[PDB]
Paper text:
Gasdermin D ([name]) is the central executioner of pyroptosis, a proinflammatory type of cell death. [name] is activated by the proinflammatory caspase-1 and caspase-11 via proteolytic cleavage in the linker connecting its N-terminal and C-terminal domain ([name]^Nterm^, ^Cterm^). The released N-terminal domain is sufficient to form pores in the plasma membrane, resulting in swelling and subsequent rupture of the cell. Human [name] is a 52 kDa protein composed of an N-and a C-terminal domain (hGSDMD^Nterm/C-term^) joined by a 44 amino acid (aa) linker.
Author numbering: 282 to 480
């Protein structure tokens, strides 16, 4: 099949997330503080994406200024040589972030700062799981409010999902699945799951 299901998406993400749990906690905290600043600055988001390339630079990586440099410091040794253990997962994250809007990046920044990644991660993951098959439009039964999320026009979870192309409503049905939202909803899930794995 062309597509994957949420099970396959989850499996794919977990190949990266599984070994983030063995990463040193002090690293992940510094990395998460750096990623917060990167998610708040589109330019640093692009600067970091270029510096890492895709992790295949044979030589040392030159240090950078600002948030991009803050993240980059966490991924290199004393020489500036990237540690694939740390760089590749960040590359995967940056790849998924390319599909999201700056509005979503800053919403993810707020989630990092307040350490509230599990909420949106479950809402996005549950919508992906209950929207099968993704190529079909479908009104959905899940009310995000009954998961403990603030739900309403302008709410973080609203804007986060509205930016993916979903058709949102104040009342039932709160969410209608749109096939065009597949890629951004999947990338959104991956970005949340990778960030959460670091937390």
């Amino acid at each position: 099949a062309f597509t994957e299901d949420f099970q396959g998406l989850r499996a794919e993400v977990e190949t990266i997330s599984k070994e983030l749990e063995l990463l040193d906690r002090e690293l992940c905290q510094l990395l998460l503080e750096g990623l917060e600043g990167v998610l708040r600055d589109q330019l640093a988001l692009r600067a970091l994406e270029e510096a890492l390339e895709q992790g295949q630079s044979l030589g040392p990586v030159e240090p950078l200024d600002g948030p991009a440099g803050a993240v980059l410091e966490c991924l290199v040794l004393s020489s500036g040589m990237l540690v694939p253990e740390l760089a590749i997962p960040v590359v995967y994250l940056l790849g998924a972030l390319t599909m999201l809007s700056e509005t979503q990046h800053k919403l993810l920044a707020e989630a990092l700062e307040s350490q509230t990644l599990l909420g949106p991660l479950e809402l996005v993951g549950s919508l992906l799981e209950q929207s099968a098959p993704w190529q079909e439009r479908s009104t959905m039964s899940l009310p995000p409010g009954l998961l403990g999320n603030s739900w309403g026009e302008g709410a973080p979870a609203w804007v986060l999902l509205d930016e993916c192309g979903l058709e949102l409503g104040e009342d039932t049905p709160h969410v209608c699945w749109e096939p065009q939202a597949q890629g951004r909803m999947c990338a959104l899930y991956a970005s949340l799951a990778l960030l959460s794995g670091l937390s």
